[PDB]
């Protein structure tokens, strides 16, 4: 039940924990239950989970081309894996809104003499999430800021503790889009369950 | 009924032609990998026999009525054969000699003179002294270029007479015939169509070149204070080259991020105890993984992959001896350039093997730019960071860096983009000269007007109609066509994009590796197997997806650099004025 306690993380900062399915189904109301390389009746185990709307559920499905699986979270699913998409009232606390990274790409310094100065950002230098890993911290931080700025589509150039081959900061330009909920009294969650 | 005669003729031709070809090629190989007086004699007599055979069967082929041949492949084989001389040979031999033995003498000591390959090339490559560079530049053209004038003039007149005898408008029209094909609907390609396509693609490149030109200009202004105008053309002698063909040597002056070194795995191969045999074996598995041919037992026996310890020619070449006999001649070192070259040269072998099943006369590339373009694309793939990483040469956790990508792309642009206006302008000038659009007494005048308008380069010294700058280049003095370099570059990128699309690569095009991609290999092979049996437009479509020439893939390849340059030039003039000169 721990994953339903406190708040619910956004796609770019998905929660992960490692350890009765029927009991879980008594906490939330499942809309979609699909499995890849495993029978749902059969489902160490690990769960990757985050807030995500039901209406845009399509993005959660394997093989789909989307921003979610490009910049936020992509399931490699090398182990047998199941996807559960469900809604529930955590009152944990329900999400106020849903923030997703829509883009992130690398920047180089305009003036080589100053690694901390003005940057030139190149759209072609796309930084996409690696399956199973979280987004880079210069990408995820934009998502975190976008989730609170108030702009429904926030953009920013940030660096966050990651260094290049010389020891200088890595800067990346990110774009985050915030979507307002239709049902304001429920949380929409996505759960990726692997053996 | 003549369709049948033509067939038995070609059958007999092939039986004798392959025998004579093989022995001729073997003699040449033996010379190049030994070099003796005995071997040069054997080579010379072997070449003689083939030549007399070929000419005798040319005369027979020309007695056939091509218009009544039904089988297209028979028609093309007949064409392979079917398609003032003393005076012209004298002019051509003298021109070549003058270029080869050309030297520039010092003004304070006429007894001490430098030759192109013994010192003048090193001045143009390494010198940072405005006046030393100018001496070598002007000296070459004054001493050599002014000798080739009366010879180039006679050359042009004699060549036009030849071309017209063969029912061409001029010698330029003759050369453009290398792109002419027959075919249904729009597969056919006209000689004058090349002109439209070359000019059409050029106009789409200009914006990229103008920004690259402006960037280089601001860097040279610092290197040579008060010598270069911020809104003017670049002085010809400051481009790091005797002719300005490439901007490669300016990298040390233009490098965006000088503290951000490129990837070099020389040390890795040395520590891991690599050698020539290892390098070629790694190249072989690359081609096998994409889905092409492995090397034969003969290849691994009679090739020269190392310098012997004889007198040999170490210049890397791919040989097709005949009768399924393939070899590579290359004095391989453990560096990085030879590593990538091994892929280039083996790429040639892959093509040669692919069409080994074609009729003798059709065993060649579909177009003059296809054979080389294939080599280049295979080489590029093997140079990617992920390939080097998977080979165990680049650190598995090697840190990512965006500045090094900009450094890489610019270096590529200096060699690839900065040369296209040169090829375009040079060939255009010659075409106009052959047509008669440029008067005999306005050759120099137009050379420099066109160069200033098209390339953005200005003469350091006033020249009159006693100079010939075009003929100061190897290809012009030695009667070679030049356009092949223009079309090769464009095809190279069309091929790479299509294969990276087939391989389902998502990301920057400059970071694409086609390894472990049988689909890309199958698509490539389909084109390679055709040889000259089909129009190059057909062969092109089979690999690109379209039968037209398209420069866009080139512009997409360098797009990340274009965006960078645009911002760098925010406070700079872009383009140039031609009213300024030094
Ligand atoms: C998505 O939901 C979040 C909350 O979970 C919204 O964040 C809230 O946005 C408001 C308006 O900007 C913040 O109030 C402002 O705070 C600043 C100080 O930082 C103050 O100067 C302003 O006058 C105003 O009071 C509020 O603090 C912030 N909530 C939190 C916890 O930080 C976000 O705006 C929503 N996004 C969209 C598109 O609706
Ligand atoms: C390089 O060429 C020389 C000939 O100039 C070759 O020497 C001959 O070798 C044959 C055996 O194959 C002898 O029968 C001849 O008498 C040799 N002639 C001379 C003048 O020595 C030499 O073998 C060749 N080297 C290679 C590697 O092929
Ligand atoms: C916020 O939105 C406005 C209006 O579109 C835009 O001009 C501004 O740049 C945005 N700020 C950020 C950080 O995205
Ligand atoms: C040319 O080929 C014909 C084939 O009929 C042959 O008779 C003739 O002798 C050949 N001429 C030479 C110089 O080889
Ligand atoms: C033979 O060649 C002539 C051209 O010299 C051509 O006019 C004629 O039609 C050809 N014969 C046939 C059957 O095509
Ligand atoms: C490779 O480098 C290591 C140092 O990291 C050295 O100890 C080793 O001897 C080197 N091996 C070779 C073949 O140079
Ligand atoms: C390479 O080609 C030879 C041809 O004799 C063949 O016997 C061998 O099995 C091939 N190896 C691979 C890996 O294809
Ligand atoms: C290659 O050289 C070896 C020498 O060990 C020999 O046994 C083999 O027959 C040769 N193969 C060919 C194709 O020449
Ligand atoms: C291709 O895959 C093999 C493993 O099957 C790997 O060893 C090799 O490095 C790969 N080549 C690439 C991705 O360049």
Numbering used by the authors:
A (entry chain B): 386 to 404, 410 to 433, 440 to 487, 491 to 594
B (entry chain A): 21 to 103, 110 to 335, 338 to 610
Give the text the authors published on this PDB structure.
Notably, two Pteronotus bat ACE2s (P.dav and P.par) but not the additional two Pipistrellus bat orthologs tested (P.pip and P.kuh) were functional receptors, underscoring the importance of specific sequence determinants over phylogenetic relationships of the bat hosts. Interestingly, ACE2 glycans can play contrasting roles in host range determination of ACE2-using merbecoviruses.
Cryo-EM analyses reveal that these viruses recognize ACE2 through an unprecedented binding mode, mapping >45Å away from the footprint of any other coronaviruses, emphasizing multiple independent acquisitions of ACE2 usage in bat MERSr-CoVs.
